[PDB]
């Protein structure tokens, strides 16, 4: 039908909301991950780390994983292989992303605070 009118007003096609949201979450999370590895490797100004926001972005990480999986489940029944490949690829990169940042956080214990 008229995808101009579909994308124009009042709605969105089913799915393809959560995928785009996961894309922008992926963008901002590469931004913060690159900043973290940069400041951990060379410039060494830990006072301006992301030592302050530590659990809310983890919550953002897991909800982004959930929305990527949920959009994949909601878009699988389209019968088209490209959409399924799109959803599986974004899910895979988000999951490996999550494991990488979890490993980086677990490596960065002795630098935050002590209880």
């Amino acid at each position: 039908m008229r995808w101009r009118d579909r994308i124009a007003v009042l709605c969105f096609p089913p799915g393809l909301m959560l995928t785009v949201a996961a894309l922008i979450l992926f963008f901002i999370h590469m931004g913060v991950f690159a900043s973290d590895v940069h400041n951990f490797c060379v410039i060494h100004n830990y006072d301006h780390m992301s030592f302050r926001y530590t659990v809310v972005l983890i919550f953002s990480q897991v909800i982004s994983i959930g929305w990527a999986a949920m959009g994949s489940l909601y878009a699988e029944m389209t019968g088209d292989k490209f959409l399924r490949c799109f959803a599986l690829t974004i899910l895979i990169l988000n999951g490996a992303m999550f494991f990488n940042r979890l490993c980086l956080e677990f490596l960065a214990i002795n630098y935050r605070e002590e209880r």
Binding site: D5, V9, M17, R52, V55, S60
Partner: protein, 168 residues
């Protein structure tokens, strides 16, 4: 309200309740903005959960739905899927149904809803009363008096359900 809605003179009109959901989200997050918990001793600020509240709510207000209608007027209307402005779906019969749907939990409690089936149509969810079957087919008979189309029951055809048009 038992007699007003069954006729539904000519067109019917319909809407959605996502505006309600975004409304109490906006009220809750506006409450969250001013004088939240002071957990600086937790070495963390929790202002970004309301930032996700911002994002989710603004997206939910982005879904505006003006008066979902059809060509259900008591004539030889084709039940073309009609919105103010754009139009998407058309069909010569055989797609619009009114179907009973059932849901179950782990315990086994049965909840009954109604759906006006079709190509991206709107449901017929009744107002928070689903524990017994009551009368079932009487509302289908009022719909039949309206513009008789269908009344579909659970599972396959079998019995206890009514059809009016068929494409064979």
């Amino acid at each position: 309200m038992c007699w007003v809605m069954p006729p539904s003179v000519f067109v019917l009109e319909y809407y959605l309740d996502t505006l309600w959901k975004g409304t109490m989200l906006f009220i809750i997050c506006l409450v969250f903005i001013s004088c939240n918990v002071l957990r600086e001793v937790k070495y963390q600020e929790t202002w970004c959960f309301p930032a996700y509240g911002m994002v989710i709510g603004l997206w939910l207000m982005l879904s505006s739905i003006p008066q979902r209608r059809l060509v259900l007027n008591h004539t030889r209307g084709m039940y073309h899927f009609s919105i103010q402005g754009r139009t998407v779906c058309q069909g010569p019969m055989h797609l619009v149904y009114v179907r009973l749907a059932l849901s179950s939990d782990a315990y086994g409690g049965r909840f009954f809803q109604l759906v006006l089936c079709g190509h991206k149509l709107e449901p017929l969810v009744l107002v928070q009363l689903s524990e017994r079957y009551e009368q079932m087919e009487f509302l289908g008979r009022h719909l039949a008096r309206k513009l008789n189309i269908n009344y579909f029951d659970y599972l396959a055809s079998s019995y206890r359900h009514v059809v009016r048009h068929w494409p064979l």
